[PDB]
Structure 1
Amino acid sequence: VGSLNCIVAVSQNMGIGKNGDLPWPPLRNEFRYFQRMTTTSSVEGKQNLVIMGKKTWFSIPEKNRPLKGRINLVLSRELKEPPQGAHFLSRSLDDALKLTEQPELANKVDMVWIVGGSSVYKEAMNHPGHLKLFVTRIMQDFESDTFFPEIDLEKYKLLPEYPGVLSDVQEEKGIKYKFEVYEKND
């Protein structure tokens, strides 16, 4: 199994969601970036795994579920089986990560991408080990009801460059944003 990563888009006020959707209007190229980063596998014969909470799963339009070309794993203690369209179900992040070591997935999974929501990000971000955060900074305030956890910059280093990630300011629908990559190893 390859690297462990989180990927998020966040507003200036740390918002990541409102009422089960994104706080800002659709940013088509930003979605394309998410698709590209989570799908592209560094290893022949493997796919990336996406891990998400139950609310995050149901926030994805049905037509985009499961995220194509990726193994889709949902976290829930209430559900008894994976939701329609999903591939795997685990009752904790630790369980999900342990699952990727089992014979059914050990040789199938390259990168793992945690795609939300808040509690899943928080657990991942405070878990000892090597972790990257792929963070899109949406450069305005948007009304939100779910927030990204604090990034401890003592541990997470903002990388000065990363291959395949544009370094300059992007703009869609009059909204400026920029891509960042953070890395910790503890």
Structure 2
Amino acid sequence: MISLIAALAVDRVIGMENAMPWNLPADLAWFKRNTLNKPVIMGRHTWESIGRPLPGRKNIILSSQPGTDDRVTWVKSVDEAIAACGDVPEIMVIGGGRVYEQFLPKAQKLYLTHIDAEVEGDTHFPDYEPDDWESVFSEFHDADAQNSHSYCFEILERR
């Protein structure tokens, strides 16, 4: 099974200038819980944005060029990325925009955080078709001293 996980600001913005400009510790904790002990697939730009391997997960990087770091696994196509995960119950695709576009048609589950924040961005989550997806979990949180925007954790499953 393939799942996508992402955090979206208003208008599906996910990034600006190869960064995420907000800081929501509760959402990063949610990301860790839902990805730990699973393989994670990311594009090269997202690898550069994170800047280091994510511990406790097999890190798989898509790039058309040879890898530059043997602490992670480098692959050159979607099918190779999937194969490199092995026989696991759930593969997590962690972006960015280009990678999400390619894996969305193959995904059964979306883990989406909707953040109430207006962000100028240059990267968006794909325009997916709402009719294709059932919401099976949602949990709203108001802003607090640690998290400066309200946010909504949602899990959707392909109908």
TM over 0.5: yes
* Cross-structure match for 2:115: 138
* Cross-structure match for 1:38: 35
* Cross-structure match for 1:52: 42
Residue from 64, 74, 86 that aligns with 1:77: 64
* Cross-structure match for 1:18: 16
Specify whether residues 50 and 59 from structure 1 end up closer, same or farther in structure 2 by C-alpha distance, changes over 3 A only.
Answer: same
Judging by fraction of residues, say which structure has more helix. 2
Q: CA deviation at 1:69?
A: 0.5
RMSD after superposition: 1.8
CA contact (8 A) 2:59 2:72 kept: yes
Q: Spell out structure 1 runs of 4+ moving beyond 6 A.
A: none
Task: Note the 1:1-186 alignment, pairs <5 A.
Answer: 3-24=1-22, 26-39=23-36, 47-61=37-51, 65-78=52-65, 80-81=66-67, 83-84=68-69, 86-100=71-85, 105-106=86-87, 109-127=88-106, 131-159=108-136, 161=137, 167-171=139-143, 172-184=146-158
d(CA) in 2 for partners of 1:114, 1:94:
13
d(CA) in 1 for partners of 2:21, 2:122:
9
Q: Secondary structure at the match of 2:92?
A: strand
d(CA) in 2 for partners of 1:70, 1:76:
19
- Identical positions, percent: 30
d(CA) in 2 for partners of 1:90, 1:84:
12
Work out the number of aligned pairs and report it: 157
Q: Secondary structure at the match of 1:35?
A: helix
Q: CA deviation at 1:169?
A: 2.1
Q: Secondary structure at the match of 1:74?
A: strand
CA contact (8 A) 1:23 1:143 kept: no
TM-score (norm 2): 0.89
Q: Which runs of 5+ in 1 are unaligned?
A: 40-46
CA contact (8 A) 1:138 1:175 kept: yes
Amino acid corresponding to residue 3 of structure 2 in structure 1: N
Q: Which runs of 5+ in 2 are unaligned?
A: none
Q: Secondary structure at the match of 1:154?
A: helix
Amino acid corresponding to residue 10 of structure 1 in structure 2: L
TM-score (norm 1): 0.77
CA contact (8 A) 2:26 2:147 kept: no
Q: Secondary structure at the match of 1:179?
A: strand
